[PDB]
Amino acid sequence: KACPRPAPVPKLLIKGGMEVLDLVTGPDSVTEIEAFLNPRMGQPPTPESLTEGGQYYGWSRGINLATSDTEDSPENNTLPTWSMAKLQLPMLNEDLTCDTLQMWEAVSVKTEVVGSGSLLDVHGFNKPTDTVNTKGISTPVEGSQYHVFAVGGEPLDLQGLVTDARTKYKEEGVVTIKTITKKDMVNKDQVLNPISKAKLDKDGMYPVEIWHPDPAKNENTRYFGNYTGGTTTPPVLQFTNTLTTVLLDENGVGPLCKGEGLYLSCVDIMGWRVTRNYDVHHWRGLPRYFKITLRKRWVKNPYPMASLISSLFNNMLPQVQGQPMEGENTQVEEVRVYDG
Amino acid sequence: DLTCDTLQMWEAVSVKTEVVGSGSLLDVHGFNKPTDTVNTKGISTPVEGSQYHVFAVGGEPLDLQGLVTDARTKYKEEGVVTIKTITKKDMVNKDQVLNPISKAKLDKDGMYPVEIWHPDPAKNENTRYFGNYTGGTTTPPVLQFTNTLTTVLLDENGVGPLCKGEGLYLSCVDIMGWRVTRNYDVHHWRGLPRYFKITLRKRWVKNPYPMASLISSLFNNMLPQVQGQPMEGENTQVEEVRVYDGTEPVPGDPDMTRYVDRF
Amino acid sequence: KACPRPAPVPKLLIKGGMEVLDLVTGPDSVTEIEAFLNPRMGQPPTPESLTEGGQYYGWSRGINLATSDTEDSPENNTLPTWSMAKLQLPMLNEDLTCDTLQMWEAVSVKTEVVGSGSLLDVHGFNKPTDTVNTKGISTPVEGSQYHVFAVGGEPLDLQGLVTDARTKYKEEGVVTIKTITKKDMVNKDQVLNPISKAKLDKDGMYPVEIWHPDPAKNENTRYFGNYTGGTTTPPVLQFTNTLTTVLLDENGVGPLCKGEGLYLSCVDIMGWRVTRNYDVHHWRGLPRYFKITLRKRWVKNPYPMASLISSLFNNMLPQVQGQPMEGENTQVEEVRVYDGTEPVPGDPDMTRYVDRFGKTKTVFPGN
């Protein structure tokens, strides 16, 4: 009316947790999910006490070197590994009159590594700057850093590529190139072996030092990353809650969620700290916060209904043995076909 | 279509490249020189040093140029291609700087060292090459994953590498630095593999197969081959050549000096 | 008949060496010239032998310091210098009817320091990394780096500025601030003297520690450079045949080659190499490849042809000296210029003048 009216903004419909997604929202609504991933790298979170586990939670346990060129065992609780998570979104509408579907579509993302100011803790029992007298400042976190994240509609497809391939990783509790292809490592696993591939499926189990995000032929995942080697490289980080990332493809399609799950993955190694002893080198990693903005897109169902009905029946039913009713020793005797 | 001048052939429109394997440099166990050497404890130092990333997408093999730090180095003449292997003589002092004679192509693979052969900026080129170098003895490596944005191989006229013959040539070198062993400090380089994804489309061009060449080799291969006195090269016995096309008014000095410094 | 038509791209007339330019083409012809400049820093290229010259070609010879604060003499094969070259282009058309004439106009340039990967030569005889045993890696080329290039229609106007004005450079084979201004240097030549200006006539003669590209009032060249000091600073480079520079101006003109030559200049210092015996940091440089794209532009001729022809023909007359009729001791006591006709004035001893626009009766002197 004559009364002043404020500029329109997108009308918030409902706020809360994941249960919010059960609301039938409509065909043109946008969903924003905030989540985070903790740096599962080395020490597992389970010994909750700060004295029995020393609470190196968020740090690796301790990097012990090798004793010879051929003998090298990385000690699983040392290796920093990939963090991943999957959000289970609801099922959507469809239209079998036109064989057209609806599925989620991650449109954009705001990421941020939380907790850099924490690296300003310069007291503590680390190696001192003035070591001759053990005075000054506890040398803060420095070194090789590695920041990767990935937002997709299906688990991250990654590749095996290692440094020295004689390395004897523990054969249980960690996923190594030997765990996937049941034979040992070869030399071609040192440069690139199109056989040593995997999916980042579990969590906290695929060491970053072995499995790298793989550029497959046709991909449904947007992954960004950067590396910075060295031994004393000063860590650098940036925050802001303003700038986003667009996940749209060249056709403006973005990651459509296979099944209904949206997959997030990340690793953020910020360096390693040195103890006032034999210079043990516990890694450090910081949690990464994701904010994904998705919407509902109409897609064409590319498969015949009868085919996926048969597939559903084949997957639901057991796969059995029984007496041979086909082949060389058929027990089926005769077959007759009438019409009228 | 070898009856009309038109003919179609491939054309690289864009490329998506990525050096895959960066995180593997975080393997800080193992038998390299340790961080703290007085007690031989700490961290087996990671890969550092001079790094050199070049790649090139083209329709014909990379044209390379020779330039060496030291022209007195004695590279083995068997199993590696060197300025000697191509110029057939010893190296000249002009090979510590640009020498327009030490030119080659990338015929072989794993044969042309990078301390000698660099991507050559030939005047007419069918190849797009990108590169960056970072020296130092302890420089930390830096890399970047992403599957997001591409490189456009189009030229200023919007053509991009036309695959002549019918092949597409990819070339690359990715040196990340050297690891120093726990011994006599023997460094040795590390290199990571590079993944290319090229987007090709078909383009109509004019015919590069001149039938005149064949219907002239049919004459040439009926006559013997005799060199005679040199009418081509550096001892040319061809004094002067001039081409008349039309009719112009009778000039003054017909062989007028066109350059100002000649006066 | 209906075979499909390919796309239109510029048609190449003839390619080859510089003589290709002798073919007269027209007003829309575009020319692209490739060239390279070698690093002339210290050891000259002349002793072709690899034992008598040691072949420090492309390298400086060797750096010896100053024995005391007062005396500091740097040798001529120690100082890295500017590289330059001139490409003499043909003559173009004129138009005496409308007093215009066309000139070569350098539109754009693709440049690149070629030879970066050669610094991956870490074998050889330099200071090793593990000095306590003389083992490891022959330390690579590092240190103060300095890249400059410049494309213009006239030699690079440059300017002198030195860290030490008490340095004794040699009087032969190198152009110093003492060569241009015949007097020895002063302390102004340590900060900025508008008096110590030069050009880039010579090549491999102007040391880079003295002569810097000068931001004159006017300029017909475009020069781009970057410096990076230090003692250990790692060299960094980039190559690609896809990046171009646009030499155009704010008005969209670019370097007009006045006098049809086109001048290229450059310096590319990558850092020093340290020998093993003593502490020496040889200066190292790489060649720079230029590719200039030029077109033909009509420009109004600035100077009246009548003035030039009259000055040329008056210069052949027999000059004679008699008595001073100009200057401070003039012997001419009058000049009166009557133009029209006016009624008889009053004061017949009057004076009339023209001030900066117009003619006025000189102020009535009864002040």
Coordinates of C-alpha atoms in Angstrom, one line a residue, chain A residues 25 41 86 110 226 258 268 274 284 292 296:
Chain A
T25 CA 8.7 -28.1 0.0
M41 CA 44.4 -38.3 10.7
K86 CA 27.5 -38.7 3.3
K110 CA 31.1 -22.3 1.0
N226 CA 46.6 -27.6 -3.2
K258 CA 23.3 -40.6 -7.2
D268 CA 43.7 -30.5 5.7
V274 CA 58.5 -31.2 17.1
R284 CA 48.3 -31.5 12.6
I292 CA 26.3 -26.8 0.4
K296 CA 15.9 -30.0 -7.3

